[PDB]
Structure 1
Amino acid sequence: MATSSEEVLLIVKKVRQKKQDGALYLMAERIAWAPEGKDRFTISHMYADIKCQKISPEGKAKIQLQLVLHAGDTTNFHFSNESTAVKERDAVKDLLQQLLPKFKRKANKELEEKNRMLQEDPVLFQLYKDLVVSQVISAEEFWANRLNVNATDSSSTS
Structure 2
Amino acid sequence: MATSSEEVLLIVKKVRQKKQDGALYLMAERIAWAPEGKDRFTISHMYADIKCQKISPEGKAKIQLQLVLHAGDTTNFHFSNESTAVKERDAVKDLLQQLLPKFKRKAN
TM-score by length of 1: 0.51
Offset from partner CA, 1:7-62 (integer Å, 9 cap, x none): 22112232123633221111122211111335441220111123243244555544
| Structure 1: unaligned runs, 5 residues or longer | 108-157
Judging changes above 3 Å, is the alpha-carbon distance between structure 1 residues 38 and 92 closer, same or farther for their aligned structure 2 residues? Answer: same
CA contact (8 A) 2:57 2:65 kept: no
Matched-pair identity in %: 99
Which structure features the higher share of helix residues?
Answer: 1
Deviation of the 1:80 alpha carbon = 2.3
Deviation of the 1:66 alpha carbon = 1.4
Offset from partner CA, 1:57-107 (integer Å, 9 cap, x none): 555544322112222321111212343423244323332222223123999
| Structure 2: unaligned runs, 5 residues or longer | none
Q: 14-23 or 72-81, which moves further after superposition?
A: 14-23
> Aligned-residue CA RMSD in angstroms?
5.4
Whole-Å separation in 2 of the counterparts to 1:59 and 1:104? 25
Judging changes above 3 Å, is the alpha-carbon distance between structure 1 residues 60 and 25 closer, same or farther for their aligned structure 2 residues? Answer: same
How many residue pairs get aligned? The number is: 108
SS in 2 for 1:75: strand
Larger RCO: 1 or 2 (CA < 8 Å, sep 6+): 2
Whole-Å separation in 2 of the counterparts to 1:11 and 1:53? 20
Whole-Å separation in 1 of the counterparts to 2:56 and 2:90? 11
Judging changes above 3 Å, is the alpha-carbon distance between structure 1 residues 87 and 79 closer, same or farther for their aligned structure 2 residues? Answer: same
TM-score by length of 2: 0.68
Judging changes above 3 Å, is the alpha-carbon distance between structure 1 residues 5 and 105 closer, same or farther for their aligned structure 2 residues? Answer: farther
CA contact (8 A) 1:35 1:42 kept: yes
Judging changes above 3 Å, is the alpha-carbon distance between structure 1 residues 4 and 73 closer, same or farther for their aligned structure 2 residues? Answer: farther
CA contact (8 A) 1:33 1:44 kept: yes
SS in 1 for 2:22: strand
Judging changes above 3 Å, is the alpha-carbon distance between structure 1 residues 50 and 89 closer, same or farther for their aligned structure 2 residues? Answer: farther
